[PDB]
């Protein structure tokens, strides 16, 4: 380092390497559909199940 040359003297370099990037590894993941339940609110995914039979039982009772 050029400031470290100003109090002591360097010899020839034995190794010349650079700055690498350390980061922690996420170690992968699995595919999932609970992840797909998330961009909508999770109560609405159960709210889909509600009015389907609201149409269905009304269609069942007026078969007359």
């Amino acid at each position: 380092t050029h400031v470290r040359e100003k109090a002591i003297d360097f010899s020839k370099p034995f190794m010349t390497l650079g700055v690498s990037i350390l980061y922690r590894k996420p170690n992968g993941t699995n595919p999932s559909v609970f992840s797909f339940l998330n961009p909508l609110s999770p109560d609405i995914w159960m709210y889909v199940l509600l009015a389907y039979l609201g149409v269905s039982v009304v269609l069942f009772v007026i078969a007359r």
Binding site: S41, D43, I44
Partner: peptide, 22 residues
Amino acid sequence: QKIGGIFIVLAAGLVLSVLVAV
């Protein structure tokens, strides 16, 4: 509730298709 949940606008046709009396 995030965007919706209104079952109130939807219930108009439920009372509409009951008409069987002449």
